[PDB]
Each structure stands twice: as C-alpha cells, then as structure tokens.
Design a protein around this ligand. Structure first.
Ligand SMILES: O=C(NC1=c2ccccc2=C2C1=CC=CC2c1nc2ccncc2[nH]1)c1cccc2ncccc12
Length: 207
C-alpha cells in the first residue's frame, strides 16, 4: 500500500463537501451513475474500432449494491476502468482543474448540486461517505484499490479481491446518519428522479 498527499485545491474541496451544511445529499448517486455511464460509453466506443477490448467482458451494465451489515453502498460498472497512472496522475490533474473551476463557480453563486459540470462529481460521494474505496480494472493494467477517508491523503495498492474482468466499483462506507441510502425504496426513488434515462441497465440489488 502506497500513500499519497492530495494537492491543496482538491483537499480544500473535500473539506468543503464534508463540512458545508447542504441537505440535498441524494445527488451523489446521480453523479456516480453518470460517471459509470460515461466509462461504459468510453469502452463501448473503443470496442467499435477494436472488438477485442470486450474480451474482458461483453456486458455493459451498472449495479447498485446495498449492504446493511457493512453499512456500504457499492456502485459497480463494467466501463473502461482506470489504470494506476489514471488513479495517481491523470485524475489528479483533472481533480485540480475541475476543483478550481467549481470553486470559482460556487463563489459566484452556483450550487453544490452542479459539481458534475466540473468533472469532479465523484467527490460528491463525500456528502454521504466517511470513506470511499475504488476497485478498478482497465484492460491495460492490473486490478487496483484507491481509497480515502479525506484528511489529506489517499492510498493505492494492487487489489487481491475478487477479480473483476474490467470496470470500477465505488464502495461508499456511509456516515452513520446516512443509512437511508441502503433502503430499497430510497435508492429506487433517487434513480427514478435523476437517472431514469441512462443508456445501460441499472440493477438495484436487494438484501
Ligand atoms: O470519475 C472517475 N473517477 C475519479 C475522479 C474523477 C475526477 C477527479 C478525480 C477522480 C478519481 C476517481 C477515482 C479514483 C481516484 C481519483 C483521484 N485520483 C487522484 C489523484 C490525486 N488527486 C486527486 C485524485 N482523485 C472515473 C474515471 C474513469 C472511469 C470511471 N468509471 C466508473 C466510475 C468512475 C470513473
């Protein structure tokens, strides 16, 4: 396990999301589903030039998996996935530029719900999660786990968990007062409100 420091801008955005009073927390789910949809569109498009890119799995889907015992909500997709360089380097560049644009937009009067327009919608996970774990597998690299509970650092390690084929799992270790996002009726309500037209099957698992 390697430990990395967040740069100042993204660290400030994580604190803003964790500390600001903002009741409309449900938008995190739309943001993560949108990220999954974009990752699925990317692998699908690449497969039109190179069909062997789906040798790691033909199915293009999104699964929502609540676990009351573990207090986790997992968003699983079979999209393009992320390489180690994406996790450490490329996405750090996006986090910095997207945060700067978002903070500029907020100071003007924009809302936290607009975070996805700045490419950093993933960070809306911190509206509901104390810790976020990303398990990912890209065709050009091995399976990795990125993780952060904020506090200025994140970790990356090769993941020895169940092999994924290709894609990403965003595991939300929910805050104690955010367990409504484990309830079937609540998740169904949010998906119907914000994600009804996503171009991939979204399966809401139950317990
Ligand atoms: O939105 C996506 N992911 C991510 C973010 C989106 C924007 C910025 C940083 C993102 C990161 C995401 C996942 C894991 C780490 C990460 C990150 N690395 C960093 C290094 C240094 N500083 C800050 C950092 N933030 C995403 C990307 C590609 C395929 C996907 N598939 C499904 C769901 C999400 C994705």
């Amino acid at each position: 396990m390697e430990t990395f420091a967040f740069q100042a801008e993204i660290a400030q955005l994580m604190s803003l999301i964790i500390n600001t009073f903002y009741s409309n927390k449900e938008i995190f789910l739309r943001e993560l589903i949108s990220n999954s949809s974009d990752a699925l569109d990317k692998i699908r498009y690449e497969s039109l030039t190179d069909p062997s890119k789906l040798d790691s799995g033909k199915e293009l889907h999104i699964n929502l998996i609540p676990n009351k015992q573990d207090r986790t909500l997992t968003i699983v997709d079979t999209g393009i996935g992320m390489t180690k360089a994406d996790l450490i380097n490329n996405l750090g560049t996006i986090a910095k530029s997207g945060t700067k644009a978002f903070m500029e937009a907020l100071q003007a009067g924009a809302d936290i719900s607009m975070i996805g327009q700045f490419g950093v919608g993933f960070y809306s996970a911190y509206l509901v999660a104390e810790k976020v774990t990303v398990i990912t597998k890209h065709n050009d690299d091995e399976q990795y786990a990125w993780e952060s509970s904020a506090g200025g650092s994140f970790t990356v390690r090769t993941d020895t968990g169940e092999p994924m084929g290709r894609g990403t799992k965003v595991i939300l270790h929910l805050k104690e007062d955010q367990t409504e996002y484990l309830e079937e009726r609540r998740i169904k309500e949010i998906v119907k409100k914000h994600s009804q037209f996503i171009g991939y099957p979204i399966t809401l698992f139950v317990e």
